[PDB]
Design a protein around this ligand. Structure first.
Ligand code: DGD
Ligand code: CLA
Ligand code: CLA
Ligand code: CLA
Ligand code: CLA
Ligand code: CLA
Ligand code: CLA
Ligand code: CLA
Ligand code: CLA
Ligand code: BCR
Lengths: 336, 73
């Protein structure tokens, strides 16, 4: 709460955090140790409250970094991309929101993607992601970029503030029951329900019109309209080669309902075998225990994502965009 | 009387295995006890590999030298 103690005086000390670096710069090993132990908040000067402060604020700062990266992706799609040509005819035009300079003959890197566009073919599937989300206009992409930048600023402000809002008495990060319940019910359950709502209300009409061939502004600005009784996944969009987005929206609604139900039964204590996990509950209330468990969980989820993004097609035209599917699989396997 | 070099004076280290061999340090102190094999104490601004700044030398392992100049060790 007291922000008079945040001054740039420590910026030039370069090693204040580690007590072992007090005898500044007697060798280059000092520089290397400074870098190595920069983010090892546990062994740094201070207290457990300060460790929690640093952990949470750094998480928020990294959140802001990721939001900045996403906003940059959206901006490149909006202004430095052939997304218009790709949307009208995905097959002929390869996705490209990446352009290189002509410095030293470096213009050779840009390759023919469309009649009026030359650049580097992207393999992140961002065009397919936009199409699934229903983004079909430069204005929509621009506002997505603006939202990402605003989120970046908000997260940066949150990190800076929480570096001082949280005091030595702060304990909200130790409330594991509250943390897990909130994440399960709101972040996951309500999040999935809200995204199903978004799909149903925005993406479904736009995607249906795009499949039909309609590109009318008034239409761009009746669920289950085209989906037959065939099981989801057993029948792909003949004109898009992907699972029906209405089926995807129903999936997200069901997943959100299931997550909310799980959270509510946990709230009511319906789950009974607490003792089988009580030993782990007592042992693994640690920063590194939680970090390890979460890293393994996200590694496994990344591997499952790598497999499913290819085996089960859900994004428009990503199935036929062979570089995109391959790169997605490989990237997520490596992250796993 | 003072057996070794004066306190604070610069002495060039003549111990071949010393990290500061042939370079100069400052005489921190000298042990006047005749039973000390390595009485002289010399400190150097350059820490050795073990991050040690000072060492003990015998009267025959240090000679008097002028203070280092600019760019001299
Ligand atoms: C969404 C994410 C929401 C996260 C959860 C938010 C929690 C709500 C906070 C409640 C309001 C609050 O506590 O309200 C108060 C908050 C926190 O204030 C805290 O207020 C405290 C008040 O203290 C006082 O509090 C008591 C007051 O009675 C006593 O007086 C006590 O003694 C005394 O300490 C202390 O002063 C703390 O130091 C101070 O941090 O106020 C602040 O500072 C306000 C901070 C708002 C930051 C908003 C950043 C948004 C930036 C977006 C920029 C976009 C711009 C567009 C740019 C386009 C161009 C490209
Ligand atoms: C949520 C993610 C997360 C978090 C919060 C932490 C947190 C921590 N880790 Mg890390 N860690 C992570 C992921 C994470 N880790 C992963 C994914 C691995 C597996 C590789 C590790 C493996 C690991 C080890 C083995 C160790 C840590 C340690 C640490 C501590 C600080 C390390 C430090 O100061 O590095 C500072 C150094 C850097 C930030 C520079 C790293 C740069 C590398 C080489 C990557 C370069 C990538 C780049 C893009 C290359 C291409 C570019 C080029 C073409 C120019 C801290 C507790 C250390 C510790 O003792 O903790 C107690 C420690 O020894 N971590
Ligand atoms: C993940 C983040 C990210 C990444 C990797 C890139 C990468 C790139 N951007 Mg940038 N960009 C981003 C976010 C990002 N951007 C964001 C958030 C915005 C605004 C929302 C922009 C807006 C933007 C524009 C308007 C342009 C680029 C361009 C470029 C390219 C050339 C940059 C250059 O010449 O730098 C030059 C080097 C420096 C600025 C030096 C940086 C360090 C010193 C200290 C400053 C390059 C591929 C250019 C491009 O593609 O041209 C064809 C271009 O015109 N970007
Ligand atoms: C100045 C160099 C430069 C810059 C600034 C960018 C910037 C960008 N590229 Mg990349 N790109 C480059 C060179 C560059 N590229 C080159 C030379 C190629 C080959 C033609 C590509 C091919 C390429 C593709 C195909 C795509 C991008 C994309 C992107 C965006 C991804 C965000 C990002 O980088 O996150 C940070 C990411 C990292 C730091 C990755 C680190 C780990 C990588 C994956 C390891 C792989 C090997 C590595 C590249 C080389 C190692 C050996 C080397 C040291 C000799 C961003 C605008 C994607 C996009 O969506 O663009 C809009 C995209 O789809 N780029
Ligand atoms: C991971 C995201 C995250 C989490 C878990 C929290 C957690 C917290 N924030 Mg918030 N906060 C965040 C992001 C987050 N913040 C961001 C991005 C910002 C920048 C806009 C802020 C700015 C902020 C302020 C300015 C304050 C909090 C406060 C709080 C407390 C919740 C009380 C409250 O008002 O709840 C309702 C929601 C708690 C320490 C308040 C606090 O600690 O009061 C004692 C408080 O004053 N936060
Ligand atoms: C209200 C809803 C809500 C939402 C949307 C979030 C969202 C988030 N919380 Mg949580 N949080 C909530 C309520 C909520 N919280 C409440 C009520 C509390 C109790 C005060 C907390 C306490 C809390 C803590 C203590 C922490 C979080 C963190 C986080 C982030 C973790 C994401 C992550 O690691 O993904 C992982 C994804 C991949 C690896 C990919 C995320 C932004 C963590 C963080 O880093 O926040 C900045 C964190 O440490 N939250
Ligand atoms: C409203 C109901 C509903 C709908 C329409 C869908 C639709 C979908 N789910 Mg499923 N799903 C649901 C409820 C639903 N889900 C529920 C309640 C859960 C539990 C939380 C899940 C958990 C789940 C997971 C974990 C995964 C899916 C996946 C999928 C996709 C491919 C599934 C497939 O091809 O199955 C083929 C159909 C059958 C084998 C017929 C059996 C149907 C039942 C059991 C009878 C698809 C969008 C996959 C996905 O997203 O892939 C990208 C995926 O990995 N779903
Ligand atoms: C070993 C089995 C196991 C498995 C498979 C999972 C799986 C999961 N857990 Mg985890 N969890 C486990 C054990 C396990 N957990 C144990 C033993 C505990 C505590 C006893 C927890 C506590 C826990 C919480 C509190 C949360 C999860 C969540 C999650 C999800 C992944 C991470 C995430 O979303 O991060 C997002 C959340 C964060 C990044 C917050 C990280 C937690 C804080 C910041 C750590 C604080 C450490 C502490 C203060 C250190 C003090 C040390 C000092 C006193 C000595 C996923 C459902 C999250 C979720 O959404 O669940 C539904 C979630 O919020 N787990
Ligand atoms: C270095 C970290 C990294 C990077 C650079 C990327 C980059 C990318 N990911 Mg991501 N991803 C990561 C880690 C990373 N991922 C990890 C650790 C996982 C495992 C959880 C995933 C899982 C994942 C999925 C499943 C998908 C992506 C997608 C993408 C692409 C679009 C980005 C976007 O806006 O996604 C926004 C995110 C989504 C659209 C998916 C949200 C998934 C929810 C939150 C699942 C929650 C499940 C849990 C049980 C609750 C892009 C190439 C998307 C893609 O390939 O589009 C073509 C995509 O569908 N990623
Ligand atoms: C980036 C990226 C990614 C992705 C991510 C994501 C996309 C996530 C998700 C996210 C999300 C998507 C989230 C969500 C959220 C949501 C929410 C959080 C909601 C909530 C709700 C609420 C809060 C409610 C409120 C209310 C109202 C509305 C009013 C009144 C009533 C009530 C109160 C209820 C990954 C991982 C791949 C990694 C890489 C890249």
């Amino acid at each position: 709460a007291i922000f008079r103690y945040v001054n740039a005086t420590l910026w030039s000390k370069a090693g204040h955090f580690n007590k072992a670096l007090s005898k500044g710069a007697k060798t280059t090993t000092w520089i290397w140790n400074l870098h190595a132990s920069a983010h090892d908040f546990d062994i740094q000067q201070g207290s457990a409250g300060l460790i929690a402060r640093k952990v949470f604020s750094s998480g928020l700062a990294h959140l802001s970094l990721v939001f900045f990266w996403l906003g940059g992706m959206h901006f490149h799609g909006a202004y430095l991309s052939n997304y218009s040509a790709w949307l009208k005819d995905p097959k002929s035009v390869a996705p490209s929101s990446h352009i290189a300079y002509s410095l030293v003959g470096q213009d050779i890197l840009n390759s023919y993607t469309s009649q009026y566009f030359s650049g580097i073919t992207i393999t992140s599937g961002f065009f397919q992601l936009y199409r699934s989300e229903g983004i079909v206009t430069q204005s929509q992409l621009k506002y997505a970029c603006a939202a990402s930048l605003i989120a970046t600023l908000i997260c940066l402000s949150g990190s800076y503030l929480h570096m001082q809002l949280m005091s030595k008495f702060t304990s909200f990060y130790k409330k594991f029951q509250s943390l897990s319940q909130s994440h399960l019910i709101i972040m996951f359950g309500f999040g999935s329900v809200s995204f199903s709502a978004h799909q149903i209300h925005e993406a479904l009409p736009i995607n249906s019109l795009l499949d039909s061939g309609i590109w009318d502004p008034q239409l761009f600005s009746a669920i289950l309209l085209g989906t037959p009784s065939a099981i989801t996944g057993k029948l792909l969009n003949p004109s898009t080669g992907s699972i029906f987005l209405s089926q995807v929206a129903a999936h997200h609604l069901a997943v959100g309902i299931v997550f909310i139900t799980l959270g509510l039964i946990k709230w009511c204590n319906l789950f009974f075998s607490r003792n089988a996990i009580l030993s782990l509950r007592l042992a693994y209330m640690d920063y590194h225990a939680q970090l390890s468990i979460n890293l393994a969980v996200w590694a496994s989820l990344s591997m499952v994502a790598a497999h499913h993004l290819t085996e089960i097609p859900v994004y428009p035209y990503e199935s036929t965009d062979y570089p995109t599917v391959l790169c997605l699989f490989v990237h997520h396997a490596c992250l796993s | 009387p003072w057996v070794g070099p004066k306190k604070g004076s610069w002495v060039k280290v003549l111990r071949p295995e010393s990290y500061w061999y042939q370079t100069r340090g400052q005489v921190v102190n000298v042990n006047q006890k005749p039973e000390i094999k390595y009485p002289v104490t010399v400190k150097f601004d350059r820490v050795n590999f073990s991050n040690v700044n000072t060492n003990g030398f015998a009267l025959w392992e240090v000679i008097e030298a002028p203070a280092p100049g600019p760019g001299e060790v």
